[PDB]
């Protein structure tokens, strides 16, 4: 069966730019299989202007004042720079953008005080993306709940709504903030340990807030606010805020829908809080992220009541976390919990909600629900969060029982304002998605997991070894040593196998839908920033060999038999060598000003200058295919490219319906000296005819008279690889 002429969601006829998301591959209206590849734009939208993660001055004051100046991130629309960035991304062959926005940027002023101006800024950015021919899906983005709890996402007033005093987070170790590390009194942000920001998910603030968000009605029934459980208060305000952006786009720029904005991602990498914790007295060996001081859930609660604790600290070794020394954390009586007087002054009383009388303030909310006894520090219900407190034999599943329920509410709101929206389903990190009902999917969905080469990300080193982290997580190996691989070949094949597992989750669970890797990337600040000239007397500056191999391994993993859609994390216009992406020590931008100095009518400087390891992320691939993509192989050193496609007898092929392949000047240009750029390639196709224009290869062929047959096309630069 070919793609239908009417939407499976509404039954209305579809525009000619409609992308079907009803089978294992995206399809255009003429039946061509589409591959969408691009970048996340942008991590820089995680924080307001002039307040990067490492700067404490102004951090609290602007948010307490209800401000949130995010205008002109990710792209500045006043200085002309916005078109140059989009031109670069398009010239690299990208046709997809995962657009990053935060709840904070929409509702920083207070509950239901929406920043309509930032909404209109986003619309203006989306309009330019459309002019440049991008497809876009929207990412409501967060990391460890909010900037105020170590990352990005929610507005500061959500902390007060949860009864948390933001100024006591550091003293109690309830969250590690980059700008208050190692202490608020004497910050040394440059010493912030690599990737420690992620452990905030397993410290007390995130552990509480996420339990509220997804399951407050089950585990914190006394937490009433505006006559609602905190769970509904938080979820309703988040869904309303995203819903107001969607409504704004639908009412003020409806032309963006479906032609440019094709769908919406669900809440980014949601935290699980304490839900499913089997034993509050221990950190499970299965928890894969441990680094720095790591209080157990009960140790963190005692800390949140101001009691000093001696906590295990963890180092990240070649085979994962291993124990270091124990470290004493002494809050010296400081408590995480808002006092009542502070709630009147800075919380409920200021932001304008009414807190219920059984919501005890200034003391641990989990003790208040009987989890532990403060006087004796006795854990009373170690398994409290593993079952339902009032029907305690039943064991809970975070993804099926709480995440999925939030997703029904979220997805319904999206469709209210965007009737043809593709649901990009992002299950919680490292979990399989739940089975979701067709009454909500309605044949218009796409699985959007994230995948990172975790060893490379955490160690900021391209290692000569690696390990199959997904297979370990999923108990496919009897010992972790049999998950280990050595050498480029075995490592690449193993990572490609990991991406195949995620592809398989989709068809096993959700159905015959596409898969898109919503985030994938590598760190560029490897080797103590040797590529930036920061060590060894400057030796190694500009040499991105290691970043290139790491990048190429992750990108190759989306090729092979996987042939995946994906969005690279990320593209950051204001990335710098000193502070990276300006967020928690991460440096994953493809491009940096510090690295400066269909047409070939632009300069090689656009696609090369400022780029890092461009040879690995700018790659040939089929944008649109008559038939089904079967296999992609690309080798940087030889430039050899081979594409195999399964073509059936009922596929549609003619002079206007053909396969289109992107061939980058980066790999295939005759010359890249800073006079029009032009491809100099040899092409071998098993069937049909081809012609090249600019960076585009067009491939016409007849379908088989019967059955199905694999056609192939091979490309390489005449005379081998360039030197860039």
Residue numbers in the entry: 2 to 598, 645 to 721, 782 to 831
Task: Quote what the paper states about this structure.
C. neoformans sterylglucosidase 1 (Sgl1), the first gene/protein identified with a sterylglucosidase activity, converts erg-glc to ergosterol and glucose. Our analysis of structures of C. neoformans Sgl1 reveals a Y-shaped hydrophobic active site pocket that generates specificity for erg-glc and which is not present in human and bacterial glucosylceramidases. Sgl1 is an ideal pharmacological target with broad spectrum since Sgl1 is widely conserved in fungi and there is no obvious homolog in humans.
Screening of three deletion constructs identified one deletion, C. neoformans Sgl1 Δ723–777, that did not affect Sgl1 activity towards erg-glc and yielded crystals that diffracted to 2.1 Å resolution. The deleted region between residues 723 and 777 is not conserved among Sgl1 orthologs and appears specific for C. neoformans Sgl1 with no obvious role in Sgl1 function or regulation. The structure of Sgl1 revealed two domains comprising a catalytic domain with a central TIM barrel and a C-terminal β-sandwich domain. The main differences resided in the larger catalytic domain of Sgl1 that contains 10 β-strands, 28 α-helices, and several ordered loops. These additional structural elements combine to form a unique cap region above the TIM barrel that creates an enclosed Y-shaped cavity. The active site of Sgl1 is located at the base of the Y-shaped cavity and is capped to limit binding to a single glucose moiety. One arm of the Y-shaped cavity is lined with hydrophobic residues and is buried within the protein structure, which would limit the size of molecules that can fit in this cavity. The other arm is also lined with hydrophobic residues and contains a narrow opening that is solvent-exposed. The active site of Sgl1 contained two catalytic glutamate residues found in the canonical topological positions for retaining β-glucosidases. However, unlike EGCase II, Sgl1 contained a series of capping residues, including a bulky Trp residue that creates a wall to sterically hinder substrates with more than one sugar from binding. The unique active sites of Sgl1 and Cerezyme suggest that selective inhibitors targeting Sgl1 would not inhibit Cerezyme. In support of this, binding of a Tris molecule in the active site of Sgl1 resulted in the Tris molecule adopting a different conformation than that of a Tris molecule previously observed in the active site of Cerezyme13.
